[PDB]
Amino acid sequence: EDPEDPFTRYALAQEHLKHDNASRALALFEELVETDPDYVGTYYHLGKLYERLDRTDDAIDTYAQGIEVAREEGTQKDLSELQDAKLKAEGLEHHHHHH
Template identity: 35%
Template sequence: MSKLSRIEMLKSFAEQDPTNPFNWYALALEHQESDPDLAKFYFNKLLMEHKVYLPTYYHAAGFFASEGDIDKAKEIFESGIRLAEEQNNDKTLKELKNSYQNFLFENDID
């Protein structure tokens, strides 16, 4: 399956079921390299409309960090860590904390 047809399929899924955050998440991931502005739109949509969808936080934080939006990335990591704690999701909590520590070190943040 080509990348374009995968994106078209995901768009169709998102239009058919806009309340399912996975469709928006998949679209954000698909667009990270090919269309960062669209990826940013989808990540922001997820962070605003689907705040409890935990998978968003790891990738969104990394995306915004790679785009140079260090403050937003920091805020997303911290929100994701709080959410993982609230959801008692130890695996994701550990991944987020490890990535956050690396992020802080790489960006020389205390």
């Protein structure tokens, strides 16, 4: 129940979003990445926040990292959610890749 704890500071990040403090929450999520890179919950909601901030490519990259840490450190459950998460994201906007 201290700001030190991964889930706690993660919860405070959510609290910021509740108050619409997107940038302050973002900083905490990005902090979680440098502190606890195996904390899958970060990657999921961090990507969602990037989507809200129009940072689609950053979101997809965050989900990609999420997929890897999800299967290795987390579980198949989050793996599936993150794979689907970036997939629907890549389907949102037509990023220009000439074929």
